[PDB]
Amino acid sequence: MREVISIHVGQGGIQVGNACWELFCLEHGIQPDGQMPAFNTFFSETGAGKHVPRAVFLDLEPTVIDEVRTGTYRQLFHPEQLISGKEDAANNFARGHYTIGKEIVDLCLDRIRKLADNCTGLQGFLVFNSVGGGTGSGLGSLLLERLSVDYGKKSKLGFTIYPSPQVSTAVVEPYNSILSTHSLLEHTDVAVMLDNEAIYDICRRNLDIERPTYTNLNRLIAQVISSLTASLRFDGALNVDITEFQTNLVPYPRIHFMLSSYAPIISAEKAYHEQLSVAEITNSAFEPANMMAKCDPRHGKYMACSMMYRGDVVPKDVNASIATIKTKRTIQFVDWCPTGFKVGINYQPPTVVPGGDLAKVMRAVCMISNSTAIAEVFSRLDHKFDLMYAKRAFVHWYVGEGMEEGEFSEAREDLAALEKDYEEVGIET
Amino acid sequence: MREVISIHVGQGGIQVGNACWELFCLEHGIQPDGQMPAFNTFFSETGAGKHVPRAVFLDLEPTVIDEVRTGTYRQLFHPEQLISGKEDAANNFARGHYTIGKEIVDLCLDRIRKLADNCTGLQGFLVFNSVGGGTGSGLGSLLLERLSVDYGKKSKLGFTIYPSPQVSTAVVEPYNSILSTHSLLEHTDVAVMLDNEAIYDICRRNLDIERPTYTNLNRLIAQVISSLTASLRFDGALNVDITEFQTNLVPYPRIHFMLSSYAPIISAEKAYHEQLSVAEITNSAFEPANMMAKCDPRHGKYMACSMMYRGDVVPKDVNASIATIKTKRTIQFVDWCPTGFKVGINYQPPTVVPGGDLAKVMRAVCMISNSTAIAEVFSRLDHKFDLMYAKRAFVHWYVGEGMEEGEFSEAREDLAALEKDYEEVGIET
Amino acid sequence: MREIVHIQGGQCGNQIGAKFWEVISDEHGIDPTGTYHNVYYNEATGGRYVPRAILMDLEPGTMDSVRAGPFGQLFRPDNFVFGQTGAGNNWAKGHYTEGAELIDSVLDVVRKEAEGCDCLQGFQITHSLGGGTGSGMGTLLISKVREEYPDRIMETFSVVPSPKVSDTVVEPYNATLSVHQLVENADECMVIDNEALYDICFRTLKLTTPTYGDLNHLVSAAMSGVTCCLRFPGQLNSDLRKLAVNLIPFPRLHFFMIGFAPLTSRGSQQYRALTVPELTQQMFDAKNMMCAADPRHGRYLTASALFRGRMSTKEVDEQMLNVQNKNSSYFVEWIPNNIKSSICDIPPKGLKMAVTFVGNSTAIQEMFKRVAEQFTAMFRRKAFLHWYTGEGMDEMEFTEAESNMNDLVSEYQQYQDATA
Amino acid sequence: MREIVHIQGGQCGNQIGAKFWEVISDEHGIDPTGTYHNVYYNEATGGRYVPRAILMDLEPGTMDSVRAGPFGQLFRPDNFVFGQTGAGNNWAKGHYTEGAELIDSVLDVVRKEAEGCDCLQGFQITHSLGGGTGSGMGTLLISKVREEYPDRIMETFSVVPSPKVSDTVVEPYNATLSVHQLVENADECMVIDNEALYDICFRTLKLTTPTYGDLNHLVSAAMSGVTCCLRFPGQLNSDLRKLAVNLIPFPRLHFFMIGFAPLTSRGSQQYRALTVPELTQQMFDAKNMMCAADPRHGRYLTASALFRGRMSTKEVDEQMLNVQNKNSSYFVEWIPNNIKSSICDIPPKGLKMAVTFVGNSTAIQEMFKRVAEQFTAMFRRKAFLHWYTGEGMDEMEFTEAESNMNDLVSEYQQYQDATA
Amino acid sequence: KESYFREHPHWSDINGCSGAKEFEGEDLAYDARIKYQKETQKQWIEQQIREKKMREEAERNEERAYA
Ligand SMILES: Nc1nc2c(ncn2[C@@H]2O[C@H](COP(=O)(O)OP(=O)(O)OP(=O)(O)O)[C@@H](O)[C@H]2O)c(=O)[nH]1
Ligand SMILES: Nc1nc2c(ncn2[C@@H]2O[C@H](COP(=O)(O)OP(=O)(O)OP(=O)(O)O)[C@@H](O)[C@H]2O)c(=O)[nH]1
Ligand SMILES: Nc1nc2c(ncn2[C@@H]2O[C@H](COP(=O)(O)OP(=O)(O)O)[C@@H](O)[C@H]2O)c(=O)[nH]1
Ligand SMILES: Nc1nc2c(ncn2[C@@H]2O[C@H](COP(=O)(O)OP(=O)(O)O)[C@@H](O)[C@H]2O)c(=O)[nH]1
Ligand SMILES: [Mg+2]
Ligand SMILES: [Mg+2]
Known part of the structure; x- marks a missing residue:
């Protein structure tokens, strides 16, 4: 009578989720092929011997989904949960939120409806994604919108991999990251800001490794999330549900980062x-x-x-x-x-x-x-944003896809208000 | 004490019935040899060993009947319950309803009369005819009228295949389908509308069969009909009758599709x-x-x-x-x-x-x-008819068999009557 | 002396009666061959004991039902009066076209089996209210026998269709068609729902997979209990007409509510006691009654409680007075000592005490209101009407039928507000 | 005769109730199979004993807390009224939205277990004032029962928010929103705070690993000692209402302090000796109690001392007079002989004398300030207020409540230093 | 029809009692029933897959022949 839906979208989200399901299937004695030689939260019974995880993997680039389908856990998932697109996201927003994402949003919502009816004691969601990407923000924004207007009371748990200060793997990441705040406030309840540079340094100093990799990154994130959900899954002198966070961490529902x-x-x-x-x-x-x-x-x-x-x-x-x-x-x-x-x-x-x-x-x-x-952090990011939008950089790649450009400043307006709101709660009264 | 008669006129319904009798003989243990190594609803006894199924196989084109008259199951049926003509209807109506039907429908009536007086507690009919061919349309209408004036009281349930939304195997479909709507409304008390593109998509996404074929669709329809007549055939903790179908599903004499x-x-x-x-x-x-x-x-x-x-x-x-x-x-x-x-x-x-x-x-x-x-659906099909009737296209092929021209407009307004009803009942109080 | 005929009707009533004869042959100790191992059975040449009941239905398939399960070997093969076509889940079908054929035969065989008695107290029927055969042929047969046998009373164990759990779609029509006549020619419509039975099975007994056989078993228990102070000795004996007088105060306030006790699971039976205090507390419980009509949302015009076993009459009647004086709000006030107890010197098998509770309450009015609602919709659109017209019945009845329904509940309501 | 029911709500209350039934079974000598080896327990078929307890909570997990632990087989599954969601530290859940879905059933089962007695001495609850489930459900239940039986008493062994060591963030809201009612419809709201329990377990017993089990053991032993002058004979017996008469001068100063004796580590147990002088000197100290309000910072409006064992009543009463005359300033003057005594004739299991101290003192007022002060710094900014605002609350419901709290504490002051 | 004949699977023998003690609720073996049912279905699916694999391989064989 306890369960959570683990939606993984984008690219970073799906690899983090792969490592997370590795850790989960491990600690519950589950074998990676699905069989088994305290799990009703994540894994469910599948009416034939083994168990399947409560998860859906949306993506457009078929490479990562194919790697999952041909990796180690090929028999673990359900061959429907792995929704693979036909092209890439190209690191823009309207091509995952306005023109193409509308091809996969409805199929995703039907699959999520199926997962919801197959469960009884729902407690929340767990979306993992980056925002410097193209589909991790766009399709993620559309999914958050559809869920918030479809389910309602169930609180969402965003795990967003933001851009770190100096390390950069894209040049247009500030644009589409700002393009996600217009929907992160409204539809999302909890947002656990995760960067990369800090975790790279963490792996450097403590773990003593000098050649860290995205796999170790995802291992650590999986560890954190498993320690987060242990209270649902296991024993404890002082248990803490996932409806405790809303009462303990959200002063005002507009500042929940x-x-x-x-x-x-x-x-x-x-x-x-x-x-x-x-x-x-x-x-x-x-x-x-x-x-x-x-x-x-x-x-x-x-x-x-x-x-x-x-x-x-x-x-x-x-x-x-x-x-x-x-x-x-x-x-x-x-x-x-x-x-x-x-x-x-x-x-x-x-x-x-x-x-x-x-x-x-x-x-x-x-x-x-x-x-x-x-x-x-938000303030810093705006800085970057401005130094691009002051010269209309790359606006053509967004206006080419029906994205009304007037949203951009709006976001950089709306997110700007956020800063003021923080300057409203730092007031030593 | 109770049984069903099933007619398979045309080339579509007859393939569906081939697969259907295949499945039926398979489930009741009846080997294709008739002699087997709850079934009175379908098969009767010819006094010795082999169980003969209740059905008539009508088709003017003797090709498919020759597929079954010498195929794997020729041992089963009654060589008089396989009626074949020497030409086709060439997809037009009157040639299967005015000229050539005149000879064959009388023989069909006699044979159905014999099958009726053979059985005791007959409960319903099941015609199997696509409306795409001139046979299933014209022969269908004529036989339906003949039965509704001969037997009457008994219910009717036509598993009729319509033309799909966009794909077709004949270009004169909108004509020889509208003329059968008049027959389908009055004499055919109910109508289980079936299509192809729906089952096509079902096969293409559910069963993973990438290159489906008519035999797969027919196997699936056979399963559906077996599921329908389950309660009559087999045991049941809580049963339903083929008369109970009608009053539980016919709110008004003109909305029963x-x-x-x-x-x-x-x-x-x-x-x-x-x-x-x-x-x-x-x-x-x-x-x-x-x-x-x-x-x-x-x-x-x-x-x-x-x-x-x-x-x-x-x-x-x-x-x-x-x-x-x-x-x-x-x-x-x-x-x-x-x-x-x-x-x-x-x-x-x-x-x-x-x-x-x-x-x-x-x-x-x-x-x-x-x-x-x-x-x-009806409205959709209506559109097609429009873009033909403006140019009297293919009309002389119909007038060349004794069918008055004005019948097209009359059947058109007849189906507009349905498009009026089925969007009049679904209105608030 | 003091016999009972038990007519059946509809496959629902047929299964219920099958399970009832199951429980009766169990209590009196009769193996399914009719050998011992007058109120219910008849002697038979050679020493057999054949139950007195008449089974009527229109789908002969249901025959193979009762002939299949144990204790089906009992009924004499000459009582199986059936038809050929079937009910078709229609009222006018089984009441104006097909009923009008076999009803005469049913009446003649009932006459053959009736005068075989010497002092017949009353009847009791088993059927649904919307099921074609059951509802239609049962109300017709009740009309015939109540215009034939006025002295006796017509008990009726009608299983009402509770529209929460759905099985058919045109049930409200036939439900009204049966109510309008059963209020007119039947004195005890001891209605029963399925919602409350599935509820009692889910929680009071923690049952997981309640099949129709189980609910029929529970109703069979209640039906055996409703007449235990009659064929068995007791410190204060009851009958079918003491019920009729102590319960109905009017010609048409004669619709009832049922309950039984004690029902417990396995994991719970180790923790409780078995005494008239707890049996009573369990008896008046809302979740322990087989009528989907919240008793707290109404009152009791009156109630009877047949205990079976052996206990000091003092604790019984004192606790009756106590449970009345405590909840005197939910008991009517213009009737003194509205409750009535009775005691029997022999309990059923297995247990030691058993409380069979009956109540003429002003709450089951709700159990009709809902039906009315459905009608008031499906009649103004005149939906599913073209079947009920061209077969013998015309729309007219429907209209007036609903009228009476209003009046019925209306009357109940006024006594919920009649204070003096 | 003079029975008591045991309502338990929330995780803390349920775990303490488990430990308390363990201690009661230890005293009366009942192994977990519920057999001997009427005030609290109740009989069941086969000489079995089931405690007249009732367990409620919003999260079902606590079931595997009470059934798993030893002596968990005494209870009855019908007394486990368990929801499915868990109020989640949100008071409004257990009082306006989810509360009103289980309060009906829990009131039904309380009434069932209450009518089953003849002399209902009063209710006694075990819950917390910080957790949403416990606070909300318990206060709504107290509301309903004091609206139901206005003649009996409602003791509550309800803990309070820890003064310093906080484990939740929405604590002061819950504390105030439950005190606003417990001030109105309670009689003995005995308050317990985790900080003082750690103080005892770290300074009076020299323990080194206190788990919640041990704090619960301590508070449950004190709970037993409070009312163990009723289950047993006494040279001068007593019960709940004697306390209620001798301990509250004005109808609202009914929040007590609790202390136990004797308490000793390994060494002192190997060295010291138990005599009435030493027990008295150990009892009336500051850090032998379960409230972080140093009693010297206030006075005792009144205080009862329950003794258990075989002692010399003259020694008890003489030392009561002596400790009243010695620390004359720390007591209050406008109530002469403001200390009350009571003596039972049987000690606990494994002891030869014991003492339970119950003091209605004006020192707890400090507590009702600090926690309240927290509210003042968390409500001036609507911190976390939108949650309660969303479930149907209103700002007035907060503000007046706070004022009420203020009023309450001010009352102490207004009639602490008064005289004539 | 033969309605009300199985109660999948039920119809115990003569033996019984008149009151209400045993109702075959949970069948006292529901858990082993579910386990064996699941095992049977897994066997069915394994067999169906083992057959479909060969039926497919026939196609590649035909393709090699055609080449
Ligand atoms: N923590 C973590 N971050 C990842 C991982 N893989 C990718 N990322 C982040 O993904 C971001 C790149 O954007 P993408 O998510 O790949 O772009 P997209 O939205 O998926 O669109 P396409 O990849 O073009 O289909 C980088 O900032 C990475 O930090 C991972 O395994 N762990
Ligand atoms: N789903 C399905 N459709 C079929 C099948 N066989 C034929 N059809 C459809 O039958 C329709 C053509 O109508 P027919 O009555 O069979 O044509 P015909 O028999 O040649 O008509 P005439 O020769 O002029 O008398 C086409 O649309 C087919 O898709 C089948 O086995 N399954
Ligand atoms: N509690 C209970 N209800 C039943 C049972 N069998 C049928 N019912 C009800 O009977 C209703 C239909 O009446 P039915 O007798 O089947 O119509 P008929 O065709 O005239 O015989 C359905 O709504 C069922 O819910 C049973 O065994 N137990
Ligand atoms: N002395 C003691 N305090 C406890 C115990 N368990 C919880 N507490 C405290 O009680 C508060 C929560 O009360 P709880 O029973 O969980 O109600 P809920 O939070 O609404 O479910 C918290 O401050 C806990 O720290 C215990 O076992 N012993
Ligand atoms: Mg992408
Ligand atoms: Mg043809």
């Missing part, structure tokens, strides 16, 4: 020479060095923090360490929210994916913080 | 991934894609849906699944029918035919719906 953090991210040899108690782990959690987004909260405040401690952890130690961390001077809360740390506990440790660089740990803490510093 | 659907039409591979419960099957039995007439149920408004099940079923499952169905908002009914879902159960699962792309599965549903969307 959270950022993640995870611990302990340690290699093999760097755990031997340590202690790694709960106190040290909850100090390391808040360190902006190993935060999973590009932001320095020292130049911001914290509205709320949902911490989920999985593994053998006693509650009194959590309470004491929370008191200490809140008593520190350099980590300051807002005045209008004095009791900010929500905490939950699960009695299951991490389950390391085979072949990973991490180490088995008896404990782990996953923090999701609704903060006010993330706002500057 | 019913479409159909069947589930689960799923290949071997995809069946490995399906909930298979009653919920999902009676959910997919409502999607537009698998409606065996290419219409848009999302647009019209249903009036009355009958549902013949088969395979192990708990009635409370049907009740709860129908609750979920009526809970779906996008589907809507007329005011004068708050109870539109008639059910019926039987305890014989589907039967497999060697070479049939249908995966063996216990549960199965077959829905037949009297709805008001079907009107658009």
Whole structure:
């Protein structure tokens, strides 16, 4: 009587979801071919022996969907959930949201309707995507629109891979990323800002690897999401549903852009020479060095923090360490929210994916913080945007596809308002 | 004490009947040899070993009858129940309704009279004729009138194949179909409208068969008709009668044009991934894609849906699944029918035919719906007729067989009467 | 002395009666051959015991139903009066065209089986209200026997169609066609729905897959219970007419509600007790009654409670007075001691006590209102009418039929507001 | 005779109720199979005992919390009224939107378990004031029952939001929105705070790994001791209403403090000795209680001391007088002999004497400020307010509630330092 | 027709009781029933796939012959 739909769109979303299903099918004893030698949340019974995951993979470039169909988990999924287009997205917006996305949106909605009726105790969605891409934003925006006007009450969990400050894999990413804010506010409830450069540095310093890759990226993201959903899936002294976030992390439904953090991210040899108690782990959690987004909260405040401690952890130690961390001077809360740390506990440790660089740990803490510093990120991005739209760069590739250009400034207007709203909640009253 | 007569006139209905008797003999254990190594509804006994099926196979073109008169099943039928002519109707009406029919329909009447006096509790007729050919149209009309004035009281159910929306195997389809509408309204109490492009798309997306053929479509139609007559043939925890079909589905003497659907039409591979419960099957039995007439149920408004099940079923499952169905908002009914879902159960699962792309599965549903969307279909066909009649095209081919010209306009207004009715009843109070 | 004839009708009523004779042969201990192992059965040459009942229907297929299940070996093959064509789920079909043929034979065989009794108290019928054969032929037969046997009473165990769970589509028409006549010539329409039965099966017993046989078993239990203080000794005996007097206060406030106790699951039977306190608390429960009409949303004009077993009459009648005085709001006030108890010195098999509860309540009015609604729609559009016209019946009846329905519920409603 | 029912709501309340039934079975000597090895338990066929308890919650997971734990087989499945969603820390869910879907059934089953008794001494609840499920459902249920039985009493062993160590963020909203009612329709709202429980478990027992099980064990033992002067004989017996008369001067100062004795670690248990002087000196201290309001920062309007075991009543009463005369300032003067005593004649299991202290003191007012103060800093900006605003609330419902809270605490002041 | 004849699968023998103790609810084996049913359907699908593979391979054989 518990379940979540895991919609994966775009390109980064689908690879992150591939690694996520790897981790899930692993920790539940499920074999990658589907059979089995606590899972009603993600995987469901398929009326013939094995189990199938609650997921749908939309994409237009058939390469990644083909790689999934010919990879290891070919027998895992349902040959309908893998919706493959006919061409590429070309890293623009109207070609995934106005002209072509209308070919696949209706089929996707029928498949999502099927998945919804095949479930009873729905609790939410989990969309993974980038926005610097062409279909991860466009088709994602259209899907968010159709769902918000179709289902309603069920809260969506966006996991968007934004553009990092310096590392760049596209030149037009600010344009289509701004083109997604006009629909991220309205239709989406929770948005976990994830960058890349921060996670690259994380893999560099802690995991000691000097040749990291997108696969390790996705492994870490999968770990974070599994630690997020452990409360639904498993035991725990203080369980926390997915309807707890809305009551604990959303002051006003127009400012809901959270950022993640995870611990302990340690290699093999760097755990031997340590202690790694709960106190040290909850100090390391808040360190902006190993935060999973590009932001320095020292130049911001914290509205709320949902911490989920999985593994053998006693509650009194959590309470004491929370008191200490809140008593520190350099980590300051807002005045209008004095009791900010929500905490939950699960009695299951991490389950390391085979072949990973991490180490088995008896404990782990996953923090999701609704903060006010993330706002500057948006501001920074606008900067980039302006320095292009001041000279009408690449506007032709969007106007060629019915996209009324007058939306652009509107977005850069609307997103701009967001900054003001943050400057409305940073007011020390 | 009860049985059905099935007529297969034309070249379409006769192929459908070939596949249909194939499936029937297969399910009742009757080997093609007649001698076998609940069936009184279909087959009678010629006093020794071989069970003769109740049917007449009429066609003026003796090609397909010679396919069966010497094919694999010639041992089965009665050599008098295979009536063949020496020419064709050449797709025009009067030559199969005025000149050549005059000789053959009398012999057909005598043979049907004999089959009637042979059987005791005859309950209904089942004509099998496309309206595309001059045979199935003209012969169909003449035989229908002859029976409606000979027998009368008995119901009639024509599994008639119309011309598809866009594809066709004859260019004079709109003519020799409109002239049969007059016959179909008065004498043919009900009409189970079937098309081809719908079953084409079903085969192209559900059963993964990329290059379908007429034999696949015919096997599927045979399965549908077996599902229809299940309750009469076989055991049943909760049965329905072929008279009960009519009053549960004929709200007015001039709106009785019913479409159909069947589930689960799923290949071997995809069946490995399906909930298979009653919920999902009676959910997919409502999607537009698998409606065996290419219409848009999302647009019209249903009036009355009958549902013949088969395979192990708990009635409370049907009740709860129908609750979920009526809970779906996008589907809507007329005011004068708050109870539109008639059910019926039987305890014989589907039967497999060697070479049939249908995966063996216990549960199965077959829905037949009297709805008001079907009107658009008629209107659609009307358009074709317009762009011909303005130029009197092909008309001399009709006047050259004793058919007055004005009949075209009269049948046109006759079908405009239906386009008036089926969009007059679906109106609020 | 004190016999009962049990007419059937429609495949619904036929299955219900089959299961009822199941439960009766179980209680009296008769194996399916009719050997011992007058109120219900008749002696038969050689020592056999053949049940007294007449089975009527129009789809001869249903015959193979009762001939199939155990205890089907009982009915004499001469009572199986059937037809050929079938019901066709139509009222006028089975009541004006086909009914008008076999009804005479049914009357003659009923006359043959009736005078075989000496003191016949009453009848009881088993049928639906919309099912063609059941509804139509049953209301016609009731008309005939109530114009023939005025002294006796016409008990009727009609299974009402509750439009929440759907099986047919033109049910409201035949439901009204049966109600208009059963209010006119039948004294006890002890209606029963399927919604409440499936509910009692889902929760009170935690049953997962309730098939029609199970619900028929539960109704068979209630039907056996409704007359236990008659064929068995008891400290305060009852009959079919003490029911008739203690319950109906008017010519046409004679529509009822049913209940049985105690019904428990397996995992629950280890945690409770079996005493008249808890049996009573379970009896008045809304979720423990087989009529889809919330009792709390109305009142009780009166009620009878037949206990079976053995217990001090004091605790019984004192707890009756107590459960009346507590909820005196949901009991009518212009009737003193509206409840009535009765005790039988022998319970059914297995258990020790058993509460069969009957209630003439002003709440089951709702169970008709809904039908009215359907009619008021499907009649102004005159939908599905061309069948009910060219077969013997004309529209006229329909109109006036609905009229009476209003009056009926109207009367009930006024006593829900009659205070004095 | 003088029975009590056990309503439990929310995760905290349900877990504490499990631990409390474990302790009660430990005392009365009932193994988990519910056999001996009428005030609380109830009989069932085969000499089985089922506790007169009732479990409710919005998330079904807590079932695998109460049935899995030891002694979890005593309850009855019919007493588990479990929804499917979980109010999700949102008060309005369990009081306006989801509450009113389970309150009907839970009221039905409370009435079932209540009418089954003869002398209903009163209800006693176990829940929290921070969690949405517990707060909302419990307060709505208290509303309905004090609208139903206005003569009996409603004790609530309801915990409060932890002063310092917070684990939720929507805490003050829930606390205020439940106090606004518990001030109105409660009689003994015994309050417990996790911070003081950790203080005890870290300073009075020198423990080193307190799990919620142990806090619940402590509070449940105190719960037992509160009313264990009723189940057993007493040189001077007592019950709930004696407390209710001797402990609330004005009809709204009914929020108590709870303390237990004796409590000892390994060492002190190996060294110290249990005598009435030591128990008294250990009881009337500051950090031997379960409320983060240092009693010296206030006074005791009144305070009862329940003793258990075989002691010398003269020693008890003389030491009551002595501790009242010694710390004369910390008590209140305009109520002479403001300390009350009571003595039972049987100690707990495995002990030879024990003490339960129940003090209606004017020191808790500080608490009803700090939490309230939190509200003032979280409502001036509508922080998280749109959630409750969306489910049907109104801003007035908040503001006046806050004022009510203020009113309440001010009352203490207004009649703490008064005299004549 | 022969309505009401199976109750897939049911019709126990003479044995029974008059009250309401056992109703064959859940059949006391519903779980093993579902497990065996699922195994049977998996066997069916395996056989159908094992056949369709060969029926397809026949086409490639015909294609090689035509080339
Ligand atoms: N964290 C993470 N990010 C990825 C991954 N794969 C791609 N990305 C991001 O995807 C972004 C590139 O945009 P795409 O998503 O590929 O573009 P698109 O919308 O899918 O359109 P097309 O790829 O042209 O079909 C880059 O910024 C990547 O950071 C991955 O495996 N993990
Ligand atoms: N779905 C389906 N359609 C068929 C089949 N066989 C024929 N048809 C259709 O029959 C229609 C032509 O009408 P016919 O009556 O068969 O033509 P005809 O028999 O040659 O008419 P005449 O020779 O002039 O008497 C075409 O549209 C076919 O698609 C079949 O097996 N399955
Ligand atoms: N509770 C219960 N209801 C039944 C049973 N059998 C049929 N019914 C109802 O009978 C109704 C139809 O009446 P029916 O007797 O089948 O019409 P007939 O063709 O005239 O015999 C349907 O709505 C069924 O719900 C049964 O065994 N138990
Ligand atoms: N002393 C003690 N406090 C608890 C326990 N469990 C929860 N609490 C607290 O009770 C509050 C939540 O109350 P809860 O019963 O979960 O209601 P809900 O949140 O609406 O489901 C939180 O502040 C918990 O920390 C326990 O076992 N012992
Ligand atoms: Mg793309
Ligand atoms: Mg031809």
